[PDB]
Amino acid sequence: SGAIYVGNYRVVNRHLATHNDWANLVWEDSSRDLLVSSTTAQGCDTIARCDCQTGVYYCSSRRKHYPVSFSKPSLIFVEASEYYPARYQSHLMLAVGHSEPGDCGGILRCQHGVVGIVSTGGNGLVGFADVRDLLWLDEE
Numbered sequence: 001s002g003a004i005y006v007g008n009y010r011v012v013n014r015h016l017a018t019h020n021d022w023a024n025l026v027w028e029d030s031s032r033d034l035l036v037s038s039t040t041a042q043g044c045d046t047i048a049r050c051d052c053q054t055g056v057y058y059c060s061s062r063r064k065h066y067p068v069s070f071s072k073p074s075l076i077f078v079e080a081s082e083y084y085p086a087r088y089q090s091h092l093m094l095a096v097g098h099s100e101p102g103d104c105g106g107i108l109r110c111q112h113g114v115v116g117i118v119s120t121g122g123n124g125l126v127g128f129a130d131v132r133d134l135l136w137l138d139e140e
C-alpha cells in the first residue's frame, strides 16, 4: 500500500483505489494501473521532471529502501492477477529487486523528487508506474 500526495491530488495504484477515490476521481488509466483523486488538504510531495534511470525505492516487505537502476517507461506484458487479465501495462519501468504482493504503492525517488510507485513484481524484478509525464499534477 501507499500513495503520492502532490498539491490537491492523491495518486494511487488503480487496483487499490477505494470507492471514495472513484467519487473524487480526477483521472484514471487502467492500462497504467494509476488513479488520481482530489484531496481537501494540500500535499507535500514533489514530482520529478527528468529522465533519471537511477533512484531509491521503498520495499514494505523488507522495511527497507533500496538503490536501483531502472528501465525507461515502456509497454510491458503483465501476467493475469485477481485485478487485471493478462495485458500490456504502459509507462512501466523495471528494476532488479524485491517486490511481493502487498508492496504496491511504495515510492521510487531520484534527486528531483518522486518518479513513480511500485505496481508489479515477482521473479526478482520490481516494476514502477511512472508519473513524470503527468505535468498537470503540478498545477490547479
Ligand SMILES: CC(=O)N1c2ccccc2C[C@@H]1C(=O)N1CCC[C@H](C(N)=O)C1
Binding pocket: 015, 033, 078, 081, 083, 084, 089, 099, 100, 101, 102, 103, 104, 119, 120, 121, 122, 123
Ligand atoms: C510484487 C507484486 O506486486 N506482485 C507479485 C509478485 C510475485 C508474484 C505475484 C504477484 C502479484 C503482484 C503483481 O505484480 N500484480 C498484482 C496487482 C496488480 C499488478 C498490475 N500492475 O497489474 C500485478
Ligand SMILES: [Zn+2]
Binding pocket: 048, 049, 050, 051, 052, 110, 111, 112, 113
Ligand atoms: Zn530525476
